[PDB]
């Protein structure tokens, strides 16, 4: 197995937890929860989110 890391908050993604997103440019994104996913969908900046 392999623990994955959130492409937004950096949270640890354990097997099954969270969602996975494939963008058009084939780049893969991993979100541990809907909140990190939702912020990415709203096109925020993780550099500016105070807890990421």
């Amino acid at each position: 197995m392999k623990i994955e890391v959130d492409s937004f908050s950096g949270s640890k993604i354990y097997p099954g937890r969270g969602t996975l997103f494939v963008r058009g440019d084939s780049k893969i994104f991993r979100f541990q929860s809907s909140k990190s996913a939702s912020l990415f969908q709203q096109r925020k900046n993780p550099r500016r989110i105070s807890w990421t």
């Binding site: 099954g16 969602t19 996975l20 494939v22 963008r23 058009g24 084939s26």
Partner: protein, 131 residues
């Protein structure tokens, strides 16, 4: 030639997906799904790797106004894999094929679901990124 697990259906009858091959079509309009049994009021629906009967709504004129087979290669509705991963793509796309599963085009733009590539060797040959 394959036995893929059940996936959450993404493309009911009436859905219009993108056409991801260089056959000259830009749309693929779903009018039926291969292997759909009988259930009152239930719409046939397709997942990635499903053969579909489709028409070309937008594309070259000689591809338009005809029923032709197509295979869904990516879907934006999230579905769960046996490894527990919920994944989804940015869009729903398909490619025109034969009844044998041989593409009308020769190249594919964008990613392809591993469910589709594992099930259709002719699309795997012509496919680029496989997720």
């Amino acid at each position: 030639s394959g036995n893929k697990f059940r996936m959450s259906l993404a493309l009911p009858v009436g859905a219009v997906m993108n056409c991801a091959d260089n056959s000259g079509a830009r749309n693929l309009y779903v009018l039926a799904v291969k292997g759909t049994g009988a259930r009152l009021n239930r719409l046939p629906a397709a997942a990635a790797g499903d053969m579909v009967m489709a028409t070309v709504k937008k594309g070259k004129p000689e591809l338009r106004k005809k029923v032709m087979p197509a295979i869904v290669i990516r879907q934006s509705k999230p579905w769960r894999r046996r490894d527990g991963v919920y994944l989804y793509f940015e869009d729903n796309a398909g490619v025109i094929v034969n009844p044998k599963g041989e593409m009308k085009g020769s190249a594919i733009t964008g990613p392809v679901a591993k469910e589709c590539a594992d099930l259709w060797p002719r699309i795997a040959s012509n496919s680029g990124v496989v997720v």
